[PDB]
Amino acid sequence: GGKVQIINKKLDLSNVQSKCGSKDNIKHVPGGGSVQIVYKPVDLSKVTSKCGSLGNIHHKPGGGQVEVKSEKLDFKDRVQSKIGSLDNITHVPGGGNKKIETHKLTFR
Amino acid sequence: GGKVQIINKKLDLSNVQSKCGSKDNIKHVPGGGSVQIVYKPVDLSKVTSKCGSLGNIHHKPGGGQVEVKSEKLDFKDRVQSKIGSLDNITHVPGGGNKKIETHKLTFR
Amino acid sequence: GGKVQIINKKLDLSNVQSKCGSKDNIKHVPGGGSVQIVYKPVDLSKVTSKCGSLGNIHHKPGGGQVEVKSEKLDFKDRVQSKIGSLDNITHVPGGGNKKIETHKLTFR
Amino acid sequence: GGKVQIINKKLDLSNVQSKCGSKDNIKHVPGGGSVQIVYKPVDLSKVTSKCGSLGNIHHKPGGGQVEVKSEKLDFKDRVQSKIGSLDNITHVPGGGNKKIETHKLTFR
Amino acid sequence: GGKVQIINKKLDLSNVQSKCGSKDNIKHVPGGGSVQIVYKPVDLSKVTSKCGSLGNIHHKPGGGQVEVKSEKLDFKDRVQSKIGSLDNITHVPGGGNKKIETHKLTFR
């Protein structure tokens, strides 16, 4: 039949850390005429801390066993960002600026 | 038949941390004429802390067992952002700016 | 038949933390003429802390067992953001600015 | 027949934390002419703390057992945001600004 | 037949926390001409604290058992936000601003 014996005695574990920084952040995006953001992240990330923990315990004798673990991701996304025209735009996201001028003079 | 014996005795565990930073944040986005944000994130992330914990305990003898674990994601999204035209726009998201001018003079 | 024996004795566990930062936040988005936000996040994230806890305990002998765990996500979303035209717009989200002017003078 | 024996004795567990930050928040969105927000998040997130707790206990012998756990999400949403035209707009969400002018002078 | 024996003795558990921040909040959205908010979140989130608690206890011998746990979500929503035109709009959500003017002068 068999046997699986695990003996754990007098275990002292400490200071198990898992850290991920600030992610997926969009900051300070000024547009003079327009801003177009298409924001579709797909997040399956894992930030895990395991300390003195086991996995799944399965006792399943007998033959013909089938174990399937599948993870399928399909991306067929269609993203279109269109702008026809832009003109005569003054954009000053800086500070302490003086005498910023834009001139469009047309004589048809 | 078999046996699965796990012995845990005198276990001292401490300070198990799981941290994720600020995520998926959109901040400070000024648009002179317009802002178009399409915000569709898909989040399946895991921030887990396991300390002295086991998995699932299954005692299922006999053959012919089928175990299927599937995770399917399909993306067929259609995102369109359109702007026809922009003109004669003054955008000052900065501070302390003086004499910012935009002129559009047309003589048809 | 088999046996699954788990012995836990004299376990001292402490300080199990799970933290996720501020997420999915949209802040400080000024639009000179318009703001169009389509906000459809899908959240299946897990922030879990397990300490001295087990999984599911199943005692199901006999063959021919089928275990199916499926998770299906389908995205066929259709998002359209349209603006026909923008003109003659002054946008000052900054502070302490002086003499910001926009002029559109047309002679047909 | 089998047996599943779990022995837990003299367990001292403490300080099990699960935290999620402020999420799904839209703040400070000024529009000069208009604001269009389509707000449809789908939230299935879990913030769980387990301490000395077990799962489901099932004693179901016999063969031919079928266990199906399915979670299906389908998205066929159709979101349209339309603006025909915008013009002659002054937007000052900043503070302490002086002499902000917008002029549209047409001679047909 | 089998047996499932769980022995819990002298368990001291404390300080099990589950926290979720402020969510789904829309704050400070001024519109110069109009604000259109379509607010349809779907919330199935769980903020749970389990301490010394078990799951469901089922004693159901015999074969041919079928256990189906299904969760189906279908989204076919149709959201339309339309504005025909906007013009000659002064919007000052900031404070302490002086001499904010908008002029539309037409001679047909």
Swiss-Prot record, chains A, B, C, D, E:
Q: What is the effect of changing K98I?
A: In PIDB; 90% reduction in the rate of microtubule assembly
Q: What post-translational changes are documented for it?
A: Phosphorylation at serine and threonine residues in S-P or T-P motifs by proline-directed protein kinases (PDPK1, CDK1, CDK5, GSK3, MAPK) (only 2-3 sites per protein in interphase, seven-fold increase in mitosis, and in the form associated with paired helical filaments (PHF-tau)), and at serine residues in K-X-G-S motifs by MAP/microtubule affinity-regulating kinase (MARK1, MARK2, MARK3 or MARK4), causing detachment from microtubules, and their disassembly. Phosphorylation decreases with age. Polyubiquitinated. Requires functional TRAF6 and may provoke SQSTM1-dependent degradation by the proteasome. PHF-tau can be modified by three different forms of polyubiquitination. 'Lys-48'-linked polyubiquitination is the major form, 'Lys-6'-linked and 'Lys-11'-linked polyubiquitination also occur.
Disulfide bond positions = C20-C51
Residues with Deamidated asparagine modification? N8
Q: Which residues carry this modification: N6-acetyllysine?
A: K10, K19, K27, K40, K46, K50, K60, K72, K76, K98
Please state where this protein is localized: Cytoplasm, Cytosol; Cell membrane; Cytoplasm, Cytoskeleton; Cell projection, Axon
For region Microtubule-binding domain, the annotated ranges are: 1-97
**What quaternary structure, including any partners, is listed in this protein's UniProt entry?**
Interacts with MARK1, MARK2, MARK3 and MARK4. Interacts with PSMC2 through SQSTM1. Interacts with SQSTM1 when polyubiquitinated. Interacts with FKBP4. Binds to CSNK1D. Interacts with SGK1. Interacts with PIN1. Interacts with LRRK2. Interacts with LRP1, leading to endocytosis; this interaction is reduced in the presence of LRPAP1/RAP.
Q: What does this protein do?
A: Promotes microtubule assembly and stability, and might be involved in the establishment and maintenance of neuronal polarity. The C-terminus binds axonal microtubules while the N-terminus binds neural plasma membrane components, suggesting that tau functions as a linker protein between both. Axonal polarity is predetermined by TAU/MAPT localization (in the neuronal cell) in the domain of the cell body defined by the centrosome. The short isoforms allow plasticity of the cytoskeleton whereas the longer isoforms may preferentially play a role in its stabilization.
Q: What is this protein called?
A: Microtubule-associated protein tau
What organism does the record attribute this protein to? Answer: Homo sapiens
